[PDB]
Amino acid sequence: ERLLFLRSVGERNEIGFPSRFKSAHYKKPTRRHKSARQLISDENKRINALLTKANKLVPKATYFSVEAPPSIRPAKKYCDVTGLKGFYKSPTNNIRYHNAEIYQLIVKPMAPGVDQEYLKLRGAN
Amino acid sequence: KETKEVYEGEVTELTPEDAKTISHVIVGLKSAKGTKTLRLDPTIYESIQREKVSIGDV
Amino acid sequence: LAGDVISIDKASGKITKLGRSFARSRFVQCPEGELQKRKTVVHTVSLHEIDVINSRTQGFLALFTGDTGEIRSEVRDQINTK
Amino acid sequence: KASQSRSAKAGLTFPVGRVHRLLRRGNYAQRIGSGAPVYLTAVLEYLAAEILELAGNAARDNKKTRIIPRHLQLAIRNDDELNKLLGNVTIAQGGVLPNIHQNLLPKK
Amino acid sequence: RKETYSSYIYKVLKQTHPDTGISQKSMSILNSFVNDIFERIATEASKLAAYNKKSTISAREIQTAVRLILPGELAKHAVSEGTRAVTKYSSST
Amino acid sequence: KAVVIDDPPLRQTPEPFDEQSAYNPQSPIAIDFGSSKLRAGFVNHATPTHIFPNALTKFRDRKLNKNFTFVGNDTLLDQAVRSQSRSPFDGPFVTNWNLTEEILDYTFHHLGVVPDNGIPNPILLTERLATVQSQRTNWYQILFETYNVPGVTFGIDSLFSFYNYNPSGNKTGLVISCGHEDTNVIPVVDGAGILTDAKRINWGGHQAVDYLNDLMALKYPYFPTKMSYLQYETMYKDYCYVSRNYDEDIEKILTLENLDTNDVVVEAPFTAKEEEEKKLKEQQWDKRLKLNKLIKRRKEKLKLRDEMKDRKSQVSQNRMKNLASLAEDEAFEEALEYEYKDIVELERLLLEHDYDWRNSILHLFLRGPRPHDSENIHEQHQMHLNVERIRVPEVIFQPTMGGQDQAGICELSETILLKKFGSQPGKLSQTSIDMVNNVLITGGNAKVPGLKERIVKEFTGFLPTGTNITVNMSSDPSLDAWKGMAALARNEEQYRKTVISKKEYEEYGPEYIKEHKLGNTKYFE
């Protein structure tokens, strides 16, 4: 019953290859997987080709013009271990910490490979 | 009988204008309840510059 | 220089050299605990010092040179109220 | 337009381009990456600095201003990790450590 | 023309000990030492890069080689010095 | 009193089918293809008909029949079918397209539509702000070839919500959208969204839950069980709020008088004569401060013995250098420390007769205001949420904490209202005042508390004094986009202004964009 409960919905919610909701002709084309990282790159090179053709047309609303500009105020500094206000930064692994006992218990005896993951959260590696 | 009038806040804009001799300076102040802009004479501007006031000082 | 022990005040910018640390390669001990400490100091100021300071005709050097010179009673009344 | 070498770009006093030259015509691989000579230069610079530090206080322990391979030999074999690294190597004019087993003393 | 690491070794002991002379025999000992560590690290990196079916020697290959050859304490000091030097070199922006 | 979190319980009832008798071939149909959920429904109704997450999977049987097309709400039936559910979105965009066709066919079958030569109903759709040409080209091709629909329109969900909450169509305001994978700030002048000054921040709910995952993984590296995505999602939903001011809140968040109130505990689910004479002499027998200083000196001697024990330390290195200079010429320390502790106890007893966990900030951060014993099984399966309750929603105000070098939402609102559209710093134009009077917050990620109060407080912070600030907010802010396109279709009759025709598509081609007031714009000038 438990192994046929899924099969009941399977034989209730199916659609065959001659699809009713699709058109009479199909002519389905082939496509690549087209990951989202390279889509930005091909849009950028298309746009750059458009400017280098038109120059030898100011853009108005593109993907790279609507993205937010960097801030003007200085960024606040926080402790990497606790999230509190970071007053000091260790010179070896460049980790901002809060006080002395945080430095003794966590920041000093930490293993290599952990500091890069701590710096990954704010993207500082 | 006397009156005391006080402006106090963060300097967000310090623009002086002339006409070698400045004419007037527009100073913008900001506190936690909002901002307010003022016009000032060059005499007070000389004391402002003497106090070494830049953008971001209270 | 490197090897020195110093105290820095962030608000006023006063830097004082306490000396050199224990490094043979004067001599004081390297401090312990947190770098950023907060200390409470207690000041005992005499009424005559505030009377000299509040009188604008002379500075605090009259506390050392001694020429206070007949401090008026109006500033004494202001100090007594404050 | 003129700029200095890669060594002070990395803040090193050992020659980076010479390490790159020895890596490229040393015939180890047909393609050599960019960051590899800098990493190797830093490693050899740190090892030379540590070895000369140990030779330094070994020579101050003899009250002298010059480095004899006696001092190098001593600074090698009184340190355990350089003992493990340099176990099978013999140093020129080094001698041995002063050691004697416990029962060989005149115990009485 | 012959090549030596004499000037670089010289300035290395001049940061740590300025009033210290050096012997030529000690300089030859040091030169043979650094060349031996160099050939050991290079053959370890080339052997590892051949073992991973890769035609390129990069920083991570000699990173694994330094983890392999050096004992652990001097190993993490060596990779720490190398990582600060490489990250300082890579900031050419 | 600990709270055990779990996966959300399975839905017993499968979703139903709309009746084919009430289907109207000439009615438009509204589809919101969101990144997290799909919102499907007819124009004539005011509530949504179909709500399910935008995900699907394929099952494998022993009997090998290949009859498994489980989409959306049917994945909420068992753990195994749900755990392999795949969404058509990779990042903000859509990469694969066959699974989108499968989801769309599932939606069309559950809408009670019986078509002939493709779908005869006009399609109402949603698209992202300033999308790429590949997404629009593929949407055009897939809709006008796979389904043969007569008419399509494209518009942004935030502008759809702003059209919903003022259906005049010519108002002026500021739209703040907190989406699944992005945060948008769009100003609307006279009912038309000015897309040349809108801004986008690459942060959303997905990055917030992944941030909570990374924080909770780095806080407890020795957790025995592995926590899934939905558990971190429900701790983000239940135990996160926006502080009124972050700087004052982080200072006293670990103090005892605050930590007794806002610390949340989460439990993981799991299944001789000389001796006598000496004693007699002892019985016959500032100084206490000197004895305490001697105890401190004994502690320093124990620290020096520990430094001499560690050979990598400089003290043992100096001792080895002294030994080498002489050559060139730990249980006893523990017993001495025990004897020093006994002497300190004797001094304390003589003063009386004749290292707390409460001062450990790491222990307060880890296990709260309670003492900890690690040998019990129950609190080894436990987490404490003290700083992460306010640290997680703060990233939309400071994106630098999230690794993104972008300005905050308040700074973007500040530069829009104070350095654009004819507004000097100090004097606000009529457009800026009309924008401030009608600030609207929408999006699914607005469910966290304290967002409106924080936005109002900062808006009072940077605006000139006496400016009237009004911020509106929906009761359920995940539904205003679908109700917006329903209000575009049903309420007005100028909806044919925005409709793409098939013959017009074959005249102009894939490279086309309708410059209407509620959608996207042309890439160039």
From Swiss-Prot, chain B:
Localization: Nucleus
Record field: transmembrane: none
Comment field (misc): Present with 11600 molecules/cell in log phase SD medium.
Family: Belongs to the RuvB family.
Self-association state and partner proteins as the record states: Probably forms a homohexamer. Interacts with RVB2 and may form heterododecamers with RVB2. Component of the SWR1 chromatin remodeling complex composed of at least ACT1, ARP4, RVB1, RVB2, ARP6, YAF9, VPS71, VPS72, SWC3, SWC4, SWC5, SWC7 and SWR1, and perhaps BDF1. Component of the chromatin-remodeling INO80 complex, at least composed of ARP4, ARP5, ARP8, RVB1, RVB2, TAF14, NHP10, IES1, IES3, IES4, IES6, ACT1, IES2, IES5 and INO80. Component of the R2TP complex composed of at least RVB1, RVB2, TAH1 and PIH1. Interacts with SPT15/TBP and HSP90.
Functional note: DNA helicase which participates in several chromatin remodeling complexes, including the SWR1 and the INO80 complexes. The SWR1 complex mediates the ATP-dependent exchange of histone H2A for the H2A variant HZT1 leading to transcriptional regulation of selected genes by chromatin remodeling. The INO80 complex remodels chromatin by shifting nucleosomes. Its ability to induce transcription of some phosphate-responsive genes is modulated by inositol polyphosphates. The INO80 complex is involved in DNA repair by associating to 'Ser-129' phosphorylated H2A histones as a response to DNA damage.
Originating gene: RVB1
UniProtKB/Swiss-Prot annotation, chain C:
Source organism, top-level taxon: Eukaryota
Note: Present with 3030 molecules/cell in log phase SD medium.
Subunit: Probably forms a homohexamer. Interacts with RVB1 and may form heterododecamers with RVB1. Component of the SWR1 chromatin remodeling complex composed of at least ACT1, ARP4, RVB1, RVB2, ARP6, YAF9, VPS71, VPS72, SWC3, SWC4, SWC5, SWC7 and SWR1, and perhaps BDF1. Component of the chromatin-remodeling INO80 complex, at least composed of ARP4, ARP5, ARP8, RVB1, RVB2, TAF14, NHP10, IES1, IES3, IES4, IES6, ACT1, IES2, IES5 and INO80. Also belongs to the R2TP complex composed of at least RVB1, RVB2, TAH1 and PIH1. Interacts with SPT15/TBP.
Family, as annotated: Belongs to the RuvB family.
Native source species: Saccharomyces cerevisiae (strain ATCC 204508 / S288c)
Protein name stated in the entry: RuvB-like protein 2
Residues of the full protein shown: 185 to 276 of 471
Compartmental location: Nucleus, Nucleoplasm
Curated annotation (Swiss-Prot), chain E:
Outcome recorded upon mutating residue 51 to F: Confers UV-radiation sensitivity
Effect in UniProt of substituting residue 52 to S: Confers UV-radiation sensitivity
Keyword Protein biosynthesis in record: no
Gene Ontology molecular function terms on file: DNA binding; protein heterodimerization activity; structural constituent of chromatin
Cellular localization per UniProt: Nucleus; Chromosome
Record note on modification: Monoubiquitinated by the RAD6/UBC2-BRE1 complex to form H2BK123ub1. H2BK123ub1 gives a specific tag for epigenetic transcriptional activation and is also prerequisite for H3K4me and H3K79me formation. H2BK123ub1 also modulates the formation of double-strand breaks during meiosis and is a prerequisite for DNA-damage checkpoint activation. Deubiquitination is performed by UBP8 in presence of SGF11.
Keywords associated with the record: Acetylation, Chromosome, DNA-binding, Isopeptide bond, Methylation, Nucleosome core, Nucleus, Phosphoprotein, Ubl conjugation
One cellular-component annotation, GO: nucleosome
Keyword flag Transport: no
Residues modified to N6,N6-dimethyllysine: 2
Modified residues (N6-succinyllysine): 11
Family per record: Belongs to the histone H2B family.
Function of the protein: Core component of nucleosome. Nucleosomes wrap and compact DNA into chromatin, limiting DNA accessibility to the cellular machineries which require DNA as a template. Histones thereby play a central role in transcription regulation, DNA repair, DNA replication and chromosomal stability. DNA accessibility is regulated via a complex set of post-translational modifications of histones, also called histone code, and nucleosome remodeling.
Name of the protein in question: Histone H2B.1
From Swiss-Prot, chain F:
Coiled-coil ranges from the UniProt annotation: none
Subunit record text: Component of the chromatin-remodeling INO80 complex, at least composed of ARP4, ARP5, ARP8, RVB1, RVB2, TAF14, NHP10, IES1, IES3, IES4, IES6, ACT1, IES2, IES5 and INO80.
GO biological process, one term: chromatin remodeling
Annotated compartments: Nucleus
UniProt keywords, alphabetically: Isopeptide bond, Nucleus, Phosphoprotein, Transcription, Transcription regulation, Ubl conjugation
Pfam families tied to this protein: Actin (PF00022)
Lineage of origin: Eukaryota, Fungi, Dikarya, Ascomycota, Saccharomycotina
Protein name per Swiss-Prot or TrEMBL: Actin-related protein 5
